[model samples]
Target chain A: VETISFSFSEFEPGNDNLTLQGAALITQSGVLQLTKINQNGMPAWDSTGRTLYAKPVHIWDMTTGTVASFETRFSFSIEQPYTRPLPADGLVFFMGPTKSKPAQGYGYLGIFNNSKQDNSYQTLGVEFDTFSNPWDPPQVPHIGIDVNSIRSIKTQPFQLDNGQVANVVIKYDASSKILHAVLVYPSSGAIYTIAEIVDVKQVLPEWVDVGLSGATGAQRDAAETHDVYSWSFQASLPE
Target chain B: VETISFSFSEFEPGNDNLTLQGAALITQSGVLQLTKINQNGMPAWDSTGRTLYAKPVHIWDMTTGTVASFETRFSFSIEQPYTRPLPADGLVFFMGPTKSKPAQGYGYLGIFNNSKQDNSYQTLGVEFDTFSNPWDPPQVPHIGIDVNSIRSIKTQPFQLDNGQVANVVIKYDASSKILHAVLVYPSSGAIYTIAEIVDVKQVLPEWVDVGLSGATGAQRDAAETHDVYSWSFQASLPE
Candidate 1:
């Protein structure tokens, strides 16, 4: 089962008031069921919630075309504003894409924190983050697994908060194709898996077509201060 | 106290045909002492030991004027006979006759069972071998120490038989100027020192002109056939 979502509206206080929508869903499940919907007139949609800045989110099997991508990009700053309404901070990629828009000003966030999207395979965002990256670890703001580039400098990193968000659940098993990640934190709210291995496999060749076009005045102040909210793709179908 | 010896009627095989004479009759006091006297003609005489047939023995040390010699050749074929007399079986060198001959065919047995000498210096030897020297151990006939050349083959080797005669005794210690060797054997007949060391003053650097001369076909054959019998030497000077 593949998935995709992005149905927007409202917010035009000036010149078509910055709005974005992306969706590329793929189908054929040796088991790939990603879900990051967000539509029903966006601004902050949560049909059971999950997502913060919402970007990275890719998958592409098309029957062994052989390309995998995963991402992570939550480098801090922006003082709050996606017009309030939070929850979908976001990260995910099996590879591909860069330059599509993460920010240019120090409000930093787009090509989405590009460092050439790190290599050894592909990548972009992670599970979720509100930003605060000096490459993390200033005592904690967890969410990990990064390789090539989303910059916080990498060499395979990982960290997940034990707070709660359905306590994390990542499974990628193409019939034992192995790509696991199971973390749960939150004792008070109960939910305690802690961590289950294997989010391993990377060698992403520079990715293609997610270059996302260019034009800057620093992309006009990151289009007047940040707001991605929804972007998706879940692949498999051709062949 | 010094020492000297003679018995065989002190010689009278014709007006003193004592041939080679120098004996040591030690009464005992010990720091180092081995003196002998019996010289009547052979202070220096090497008929290539009968033109290479065998019979060698030469000795002298006007107290450190150091002139001592011995010779007995072997590459094979030697169970006895360099005159084959009393117990001196094989290999013997306790020499000093610094480069004392070998210009054409002989003279140099400060210790013998053979090693051709050259560039002479104070020398010494202990090799009453009966076979066994490829670094020995199998038919065991050991005791080999050569300084200043007469053949060392491969650096400091010793084995002095436990099952019989390894009788080797060399002593010269002018107040620790040290020249030592003591490898006695003969179990019940009473004599079992087994092993003793020291006598390689950095091995030959040039202490020539002591005495004795012989040379065979020469690649380095100090004697193929030589003879000297029951030698002698005496000393009292050393302050």
Candidate 2:
């Protein structure tokens, strides 16, 4: 039983309760651009942006001290620029403190503001990473489950072809403490599914900002654009 | 959009359009017993049974020659006899020839009667197999997608603890020619998801029997009972 459900088929201009940070924007046709270079503009060293719902959600309540279970699905695409070929860093579905500091640069996933983080840092995010940092499992595209640090607690192969839309499903069960991720290539029938045990209460606050963020580091003015075409989410607190 | 949807939260005896094959029955308490060893009975080999929905479905239409996308979810459990320790053979959700020959013995999955089959054999089934025959992927509990033969075209790890109920979601998308399987352990939050591109039209008729079957063979009166607690299915054809 879900207590709340929301869907964003199009990030329209009117009455859409969303906030755009840094280079993020809502196009006239209702597309959410997470990372984009300005038109006919000079190259930027690091480009990062976030498209977030205006309000924060109760990840866990203090009254009963119960964590909620949540599930979400999003359709997205990563497009490479004509020059740079491949994009750096990646996009992530992030849950962080209500007051967040923007990611400084690459490898931060736009979820963590600082590049240097440790177990004491607080954040929970699932990254669809194209960039292979020193902490990455391998060089190829992969997904990482991050808790407190950019060094993923878990990772799995995630193949994403440039310019093609794919769907991702993320689910977390409070009762089981399992976070599930499934990436689907609609055209190729290829899929990658993974799960890891994680307690959000241990990594995030009761009130947290839930949003999608993308970061491209040190691009030659050429970069990969991350767009979210549609998204839906639902959650339930145990009664 | 789904055109037909039905669910059996609890299999009631009344008005439930189910047909039971050899050794299969509806328990007095409304359980669908796919394979059950009788009480006080002597050793019997090649025990097999099927619990089918009496009616067949339109897998595809000759009018449009378009395949229908379908999805189904079921909760089931396999219980091992205290003596045997583990079960032989397995259970399956099958789409087969309207008139099926009951599986003769173990490894047949109660979908194909004859022990021997080839690619020419016309059947499609997804098996939750515990027993590793000569053709199994490994000797561990796994899920297999059988196209024409018992030799699966695709297989994945599926850990099922004895006497624990697990949920399975099976889906086919006509547009992508993909068959997806998701097995979830509700209590543990463990999941296994796999997908393979398969065109049912290539291996099956438009009209086929849809059912669940289980088989056990050559035991010293020891066997595993396959029980289905709930099931639901829906499908949609191109408009």
Candidate 3:
């Protein structure tokens, strides 16, 4: 098995080796933060919304010979800015075309940024959402699996009490076309498994880029900090 | 009620004065065709899937003052090329941000094009799918309602027999958050009603673009012609 991984514990402060787009940043302490406190340059509704963040150097190419199965694991934390009355948007672990850009606003979770008048990009994401947007199931702080759109194919509530961090393990079986995600709360050891049969090859391009994105809204003073502690991915190599 | 509508019977060829885009064409006979036979220049899969066709000049703005409700009626036919064995993808009548693009390829019905790493665009569409895609329900030739993603929120089978054209009337009541679609199969005078509770304002931008899209795959050598006879839309304006 060929594997690509990262442990933010040893990374530098700047975006030296990573492709960090939009408002994402790397802290001096090696924490990958999506946005800073009161960072005002968030993309506008008329703009591309500037939610895109860091992308790794590797590509997940599934279009050529055979469908490849893969597994990925990571730990992340979402902290609501202490001063803000409401937390803004959310974060997502996504895979898309190498040139994919994050959606602009908080509701979009930074993965989609197009309209019916323009061409839509292709992506699949596992979203960790904080504030429940109007269209979301009227529930806050949930975990959802987004295929192409933010309208999750499957979702479950996951609360982060007192700004705690959580770990997640995601596995996709190509032969069966099933994707499974397990989110573990280290504090309580609570585990949740969410799975669905998704044909990734059909929805995405042959080769893809992977990354994370987070955003805040202009209307609401909500701010969130997404810190990636560590991440690992293992997949089969092409023939 | 303030309204924006289209009547194909009165339209001229070549989009002289209309705001048509992509592969959409207004035939001299007043039919709106989204794709033509052997149309080789269909947008590449990497180029946003190019299945979307036309949009109206007016915007369906729901964010400013009051939420708007609307109703639209149109007649359309999905015809396969005479020599093709299998029909390609299908069609969708969608409402999304004015800049939304159609999804890439088959099962998505051309309304949501996303890769595993990307987020799908925001849109609501009612699909009349002729071909059965892998992720779609095994029993197809059905009508489905899609919110932000093309994965049908609700779907029911409705067969289209041999190049038959059908009439559809869709109604969205903003107050009740209920969307109702009525399909009239001219051949048998059959009617099907598919309804779902969708909060348009919550899921879409305050102002949205409405249009239709259709596509066929390269492997299938399948071609479908979507012809719109007439359409009328009436919505409550913000007060």
Off by over 4 Å in 1: A1-239, B1-74, B81-87, B93-121, B129-140, B146-203, B207-239
RMSD for each of the candidates: 36.9, 17.6, 20.2
TM-score of chain B taken alone, every candidate: 0.23, 0.90, 0.81
Q: Give the Å shift of residue A74 in candidate 1.
A: 70
> Each candidate's iRMS in angstroms?
40.0, 12.4, 19.7
TM-score of the first chain of model 1:
0.22
The per-residue C-alpha lDDT of model 1 at residue A214 equals 14
Candidate 1 chain A least-lDDT 10 residues: A211-220
Off by over 4 Å in 2: A14-16, A40-45, A82-86, A114-120, B1-239
DockQ of each: 0.01, 0.03, 0.01
Q: What does the lDDT read for residue B178 in candidate 1?
A: 32
Q: Determine the iRMS, in angstroms, of model 3.
A: 19.7
Instruction: Point to the candidate with the largest lDDT.
Output: 2
Q: List the residue pairs that clash in candidate 2.
A: none
lDDT tens readout by residue for model 3, A114-141: 3221224667888888777655777777
Model 1: chain B TM-score relative to the native chain B: 0.23
Which regions in candidate 3 have their CA more than 4 angstroms from the true location? Answer: A1-9, A38-65, A81-84, A114-119, B1-239
At residue A164, candidate 1 shows an lDDT of 24
By summed lDDT, which 10 consecutive residues of candidate 2 chain B come out lowest?
B36-45
